[PDB]
Design a protein around this motif. Structure first.
Motif, short mmCIF file in Angstrom:
data_model
loop_
_atom_site.label_atom_id
_atom_site.label_comp_id
_atom_site.label_asym_id
_atom_site.label_seq_id
_atom_site.Cartn_x
_atom_site.Cartn_y
_atom_site.Cartn_z
N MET A 130 0.83 -1.19 0.00
CA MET A 130 0.00 0.00 0.00
C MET A 130 0.88 1.25 0.00
N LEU A 131 1.96 1.21 0.77
CA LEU A 131 2.88 2.33 0.79
C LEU A 131 3.39 2.57 -0.62
N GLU A 132 3.76 1.49 -1.30
CA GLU A 132 4.30 1.60 -2.63
C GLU A 132 3.32 2.29 -3.56
N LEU A 133 2.06 1.98 -3.43
CA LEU A 133 1.08 2.54 -4.29
C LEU A 133 0.94 4.02 -3.97
N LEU A 134 0.96 4.36 -2.70
CA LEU A 134 0.88 5.75 -2.33
C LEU A 134 2.01 6.59 -2.94
N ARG A 135 3.22 6.08 -2.84
CA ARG A 135 4.39 6.79 -3.36
C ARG A 135 4.28 7.04 -4.85
N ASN A 136 3.64 6.12 -5.57
CA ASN A 136 3.47 6.23 -7.01
C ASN A 136 2.16 6.85 -7.45
N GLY A 137 1.37 7.36 -6.51
CA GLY A 137 0.15 8.05 -6.82
C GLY A 137 -0.92 7.16 -7.39
N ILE A 138 -0.84 5.87 -7.09
CA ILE A 138 -1.74 4.88 -7.65
C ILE A 138 -2.87 4.69 -6.63
N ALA A 139 -4.04 5.22 -6.96
CA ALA A 139 -5.18 5.07 -6.08
C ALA A 139 -5.58 3.59 -5.98
N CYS A 140 -5.95 3.18 -4.79
CA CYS A 140 -6.28 1.80 -4.57
C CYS A 140 -7.38 1.70 -3.55
N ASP A 141 -8.63 1.63 -4.04
CA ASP A 141 -9.78 1.64 -3.22
C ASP A 141 -10.08 0.26 -2.71
N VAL A 142 -10.63 0.16 -1.51
CA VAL A 142 -11.02 -1.16 -1.03
C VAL A 142 -12.16 -1.69 -1.88
N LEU A 143 -12.05 -2.94 -2.33
CA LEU A 143 -13.15 -3.59 -3.01
C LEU A 143 -13.86 -4.56 -2.08
N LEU A 144 -15.16 -4.63 -2.20
CA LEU A 144 -15.94 -5.35 -1.25
C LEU A 144 -15.95 -6.87 -1.48
N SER A 145 -15.88 -7.27 -2.73
CA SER A 145 -15.90 -8.69 -3.07
C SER A 145 -15.25 -8.84 -4.42
N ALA A 146 -15.03 -10.09 -4.82
CA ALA A 146 -14.39 -10.32 -6.08
C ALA A 146 -15.27 -9.93 -7.30
N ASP A 147 -16.56 -9.71 -7.11
CA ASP A 147 -17.38 -9.17 -8.20
C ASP A 147 -17.21 -7.64 -8.28
N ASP A 148 -16.63 -7.00 -7.25
CA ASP A 148 -16.56 -5.54 -7.22
C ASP A 148 -15.42 -5.15 -8.13
N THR A 149 -15.50 -3.97 -8.73
CA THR A 149 -14.50 -3.56 -9.69
C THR A 149 -13.95 -2.19 -9.32
N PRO A 150 -12.68 -1.94 -9.66
CA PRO A 150 -12.07 -0.67 -9.41
C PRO A 150 -12.67 0.43 -10.29
N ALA A 151 -12.58 1.66 -9.82
CA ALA A 151 -12.92 2.80 -10.67
C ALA A 151 -11.92 2.76 -11.83
N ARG A 152 -12.30 3.22 -13.01
CA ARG A 152 -11.25 3.30 -14.04
C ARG A 152 -10.33 4.49 -13.68
N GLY A 153 -9.05 4.30 -13.93
CA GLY A 153 -8.06 5.21 -13.46
C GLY A 153 -7.53 4.78 -12.12
N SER A 154 -8.21 3.89 -11.39
CA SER A 154 -7.71 3.50 -10.05
C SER A 154 -7.54 1.97 -9.96
N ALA A 155 -6.69 1.51 -9.05
CA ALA A 155 -6.70 0.13 -8.67
C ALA A 155 -7.73 -0.07 -7.56
N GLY A 156 -7.90 -1.32 -7.19
CA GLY A 156 -8.67 -1.71 -6.06
C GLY A 156 -8.04 -2.93 -5.42
N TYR A 157 -8.25 -3.08 -4.13
CA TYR A 157 -7.69 -4.22 -3.43
C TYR A 157 -8.73 -5.04 -2.78
N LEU A 158 -8.43 -6.33 -2.70
CA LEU A 158 -9.24 -7.28 -1.98
C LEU A 158 -8.39 -7.99 -0.92
#
Ligand SMILES: [Cl-]
Ligand SMILES: [Cl-]
Length: 278
Positions: A130-158
């Motif tokens: 997560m730190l790495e993503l922050l340093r690189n300005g890579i947004a990474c939103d929490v995803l609720l389940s494996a059917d959930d999808t990231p915003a375009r332009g952002s990553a998401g984590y499960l």
């Protein structure tokens, strides 16, 4: 306080108990001269609970990876005793990996894609990536389940919990990217060869010290001092050999020094940043 309580954050106390008791049984008799008569094990499900135990004096001593350790120090509940070497390695780092047939080749291409992380207490499987993503300005939103999808332009984590699950979800096309330590990568319980052969490493973080012995805020300074001495002597005591093997394959301890302090301080800043921006 006549008792020494050894712990760790654990998602699997049934199994981790065995990793702690042998070294506790080695340590306890060697601390009689500072008032320790007996030992107990007390693990906690997460950093928050363990911080509560530490702050309340229910746990005295934990052996943790450095990120988790810094979660505990930040909450004011523990401070470093010794730097810890596990499996002959003082340091480790996070690697991000994908399926080799993925179109992801770099960290930046995580945008639009999903990342498997472990739990909030994991150094190499949450904090570092997560730190790495922050340093690189890579947004990474929490995803609720494996059917959930990231915003375009952002990553998401499960959060998938276990290290094997990170490897398994990525292998099975459920999640695009996985984060594990470089050591985990070569550990077949965490990264099965059948999965590993289908993966490519896309990014590596900077190394940090791997693990650290922490003791609670307010431990009696004589107990603290003697614990340190006892652990330091353990690494070259044959009677401590089996116990140290069981203790996350601890192959060394060493005093804190200005480097390890600086490295823990930088890691701590990074962890705080993760904590502040999640
Ligand atoms: Cl870790
Ligand atoms: Cl260091």
């Amino acid at each position: 306080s006549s008792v020494l309580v050894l712990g760790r954050i654990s998602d699997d106390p049934a199994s981790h108990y065995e990793q702690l008791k042998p070294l506790l049984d080695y340590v306890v008799p060697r601390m009689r001269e500072v008032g320790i008569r007996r030992g107990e094990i007390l693990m906690a499900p997460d950093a928050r609970q363990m911080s509560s135990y530490l702050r309340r004096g229910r746990v005295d001593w934990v052996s943790e990876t450095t990120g988790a350790a810094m979660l505990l120090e930040q909450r004011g509940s523990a401070h470093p005793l010794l730097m810890t070497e596990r499996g002959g390695l003082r340091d480790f780092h996070t690697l991000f990996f994908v399926r080799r047939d993925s179109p992801i080749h770099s960290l930046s291409q995580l945008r639009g894609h999903t990342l498997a992380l472990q739990n909030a207490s994991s150094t190499s499987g949450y904090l570092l990536p997560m730190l790495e993503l922050l340093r690189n300005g890579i947004a990474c939103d929490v995803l609720l389940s494996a059917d959930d999808t990231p915003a375009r332009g952002s990553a998401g984590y499960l959060m998938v919990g276990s290290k094997l699950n990170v490897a398994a979800f990525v292998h099975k096309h459920l999640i695009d990217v996985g984060a594990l330590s470089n050591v985990d990568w070569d550990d077949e319980r965490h990264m099965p060869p059948v999965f590993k052969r289908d993966f490519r490493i896309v990014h590596r973080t900077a190394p940090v010290p791997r693990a650290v012995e922490m003791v609670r805020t307010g431990m009696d300074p004589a107990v603290e001092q003697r614990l340190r001495v006892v652990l330091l002597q353990a690494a070259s005591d044959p009677k401590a050999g089996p116990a140290l093997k069981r203790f996350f394959d601890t192959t060394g301890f060493r005093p804190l020094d200005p480097t390890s302090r600086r490295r823990l301080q930088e890691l701590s800043a990074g962890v705080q940043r993760v904590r502040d921006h999640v």
